[PDB]
């Protein structure tokens, strides 16, 4: 249908605009849609874009408003004191501010539906909330409404929540437009989604993006597909991938690189209230943090990820146990059988389950998918599904049988409850992935697995060497393969930290020379250098000019193929903030050939200093543009848990950065 009101190009410069005469007598019926295209690249701390209020003495709490915060949060208030109603619905991290230095036109659609008694908010094509209430309050049925306002709310004759921004277009409709109709509204997005709610993964949440440019020109991405909200393991999480064959313009429907089936792949709206938001799926196996590399020799793509058995995460993982038993320099996965108190079994060559107590093979074998076979017959377990119908999280059997896997809660044979690293490969550049294999322990049988550094592994340009960075207490542990990932060895590099989340990414400055940039606990990004293709490592230095929080954030880094200002260039992606995960930047550094020092010369602001920016992935696209896939929210903040579609992709050119 057509709007009852439409206006545009309003400048909001800390002075409200009265549109009462134009709008108020147009409002009819109990359902309304507001469509608003607006920019706010210098917002106040808290400002209203649009208001409908009773401006009279004594009715200060009788208003409807659409508001935003300088955190990027968007929301509404719907208030009527006589009805005893004070609704506030909002979601953090819902907005863009600037892109390539220009103010972003956000497209906001708010639907107030009397029939379904539901309030729904979309921004930039993403539904950020949908709230159903028992007692519906039509936004223009607030008692004594007499003002329609842009850029403030009129309360008792004064301007509250004054805005700085612009509204280039605002339309109102006396109808609750359908989800279909919403989808036809043109957008001016500076970003795209690769993975998103409702896609083939059926995860409502995503974290830990990666990007890697393959030699064919295909760009590959991996990610944590997180089902039980955005929580780290323990949870249900799979590793998903998508690729682009047109320099990042379009992306394939995701497939899984690593998945478990003990719990259903469920699209769930995880609660965000303080009482339930820490609900965590507690009985599922999971994967977490992935990294990609391409091998020149074989042509294969290799993907590593951490693996967590059922109910396990890094916090409750057995730190004193690798989960393997050493027998003559060979390592075998340990297993515990139903009823036993110790691990009296191991998994041997060809997957033969072998009994340690009496040194003999059983009738059980483990197949390639880590599934349990008895006499060659597949054992099964009943799958779980999760729900909040009872008012709290329940995990229960759903009637479906799935192959029995040693990483499962209900399995006859269970692995050690600790963290592992697994590897999978693809021979068709991400169209399909093999069944994963566990990597051996690298620091002894009584040391838990090191933690994979998410992002890219490193393929040395002048050799067949492949390196994946990992970390643990007191060191970075580089995993090195010279044979297409068939065998790995470690190279330990001491770092002056106990228990740092030392997520590290590497760049090859020149042949055989690797600089690794890593997260610390000091508020500064650290680095070290190898000049022998990863065999030995320098002491640790720190970057000045970039700030992180005490707890830190993953940093992504690439060696740019082209010279800049006549010099070799490295590009880092990180939040630049001592306060939270926000103020995202790409920082361009020029290498000094005298000593391999780096002058951090250009800082490109991804969006506002106050808008969220967390884990990130960067890659040089085949056309020499830069692709960035990043968490556009504060993934540390306990206020920004469980948000949909905040991992987003943008395309940049070097001239944008400089």
Swiss-Prot record:
Entry annotated with the keyword Disulfide bond: no
Catalyzed reaction equations: Hydrolysis of alpha-(2->3)-, alpha-(2->6)-, alpha-(2->8)- glycosidic linkages of terminal sialic acid residues in oligosaccharides, glycoproteins, glycolipids, colominic acid and synthetic substrates
Keywords per UniProt: Glycosidase, Hydrolase, Repeat, Signal
GO cellular component term, pick one: cytoplasm
MF (Gene Ontology): exo-alpha-sialidase activity
Active site: 232 (proton acceptor), 503, 615 (nucleophile)
Class of enzymatic activity (EC top level): hydrolase
One GO process term, biological-process aspect: ganglioside catabolic process
Lineage of origin: Bacteria, Bacillati, Bacillota, Bacilli, Lactobacillales
Residue sites binding substrate per the record: 207, 519, 581
Gene it is expressed from: nanB
One Pfam family per UniProt: BNR_2
Listed InterPro entries: BNR_rpt, ConA-like_dom_sf, Glyco_hydro_33_N, Sialidase, Sialidase_fam, Sialidase_sf, Trans_sialidase_dom3
BNR repeats: 242-253, 424-435, 479-490, 528-539
Family: Belongs to the glycosyl hydrolase 33 family.
Name of the protein this chain belongs to: Sialidase B
């Amino acid at each position: 249908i057509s709007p009852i009101f439409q206006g545009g190009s309003y400048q909001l410069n800390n002075k409200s605009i009265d549109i009462s005469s134009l709008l108020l007598d147009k409002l009819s019926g109990e359902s309304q849609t507001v469509v608003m295209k607006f920019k706010a690249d210098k917002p106040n701390s808290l400002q209203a874009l649009f208001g409908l209020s009773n401006s009279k003495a004594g009715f200060k709490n009788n208003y409807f408003s659409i508001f935003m915060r300088d955190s990027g949060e968007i929301g509404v208030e719907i208030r009527d004191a006589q009805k005893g109603i004070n609704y506030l619905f909002s979601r953090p991290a819902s907005l863009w501010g600037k892109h390539k230095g220009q103010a972003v036109e956000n497209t906001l659609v708010f639907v107030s539906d009397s029939k379904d008694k539901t309030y729904t908010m979309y921004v930039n094509g993403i539904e950020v909330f949908s709230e159903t209430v028992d007692t519906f309050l039509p936004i223009s049925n607030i008692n004594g409404i007499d003002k329609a306002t842009l850029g403030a709310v009129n309360r008792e004759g004064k301007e509250h929540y004054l805005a700085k921004g612009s509204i280039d277009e605002i339309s109102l409709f006396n109808k609750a437009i359908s989800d279909q109709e919403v989808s036809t509204i043109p957008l001016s997005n500076p970003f795209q989604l690769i993975f998103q709610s409702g896609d083939s993964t059926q995860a409502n949440y995503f974290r830990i993006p990666t990007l890697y440019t393959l030699s064919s020109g295909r760009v590959l991405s991996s990610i944590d597909a997180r089902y039980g909200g955005t929580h780290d393991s323990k949870s249900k999480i799979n590793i998903a991938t998508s690729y682009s064959d047109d320099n990042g313009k379009t992306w394939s429907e995701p497939i899984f690189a690593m998945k478990f089936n003990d719990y259903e792949e469920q699209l769930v709206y995880w609660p965000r209230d303080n009482k339930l938001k820490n609900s965590q799926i507690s009985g599922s196996a999971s994967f977490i943090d992935s990294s990609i590399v391409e091998d020149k020799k074989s042509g294969k793509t290799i993907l590593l990820a951490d693996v967590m058995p059922a109910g396990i995460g890094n916090n409750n993982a057995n730190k004193a146990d690798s989960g393997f038993k050493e027998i003559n320099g060979h390592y075998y996965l340990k297993l515990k059988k139903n009823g036993d108190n110790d691990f009296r079994y191991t998994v041997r060559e060809n997957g033969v389950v072998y009994n340690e107590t009496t040194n003999k093979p059983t009738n059980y074998t483990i197949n390639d998918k880590y599934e349990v076979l008895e006499g060659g017959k597949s054992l099964t377990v009943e799958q779980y599904s999760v729900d909040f119908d009872s008012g709290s999280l329940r995990e229960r059997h759903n009637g479906k049988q799935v192959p029995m896997n040693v990483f499962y809660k209900d399995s006859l044979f269970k692995v050690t409850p600790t963290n592992y690293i697994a590897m999978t490969t693809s021979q068709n550049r991400g169209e399909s992935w093999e069944q994963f294999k566990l990597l051996p322990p690298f620091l002894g049988e009584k040391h838990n697995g090191t933690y994979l550094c998410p992002g890219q592994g490193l393929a040395l340009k002048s050799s067949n060497r492949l390196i994946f960075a990992t970390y643990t207490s007191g060191e970075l542990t580089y995993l090195i393969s010279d044979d297409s990932g068939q065998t790995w060895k470690k190279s330990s590099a001491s770092i002056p930290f106990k228990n740092a989340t030392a997520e590290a990414q590497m760049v090859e400055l020149r042949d055989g020379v690797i600089r690794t940039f890593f997260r610390t606990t000091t508020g500064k990004i650290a680095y070290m250098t190898s000049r022998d293709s990863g065999e030995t490592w320098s002491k640790v230095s720190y970057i000045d000019g970039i700030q992180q929080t005490s707890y830190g954030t993953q940093v992504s880094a690439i060696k740019y193929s082209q010279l800049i200002d006549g010099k070799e260039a490295v590009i880092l992606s990180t939040p630049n903030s001592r306060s939270g995960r926000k103020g995202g930047q790409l920082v361009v550094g020029l290498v000094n050939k005298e000593d391999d020092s780096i002058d951090w010369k250009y800082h490109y602001d991804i969006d506002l200093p106050s808008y969220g920016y967390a884990y990130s992935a960067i890659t040089e696209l085949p056309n020499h543009h830069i692709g960035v896939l990043f968490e556009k929210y504060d993934s540390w903040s306990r206020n920004e848990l469980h948000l949909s579609n905040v991992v987003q992709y943008i395309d940049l050119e070097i001239n944008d950065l400089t």
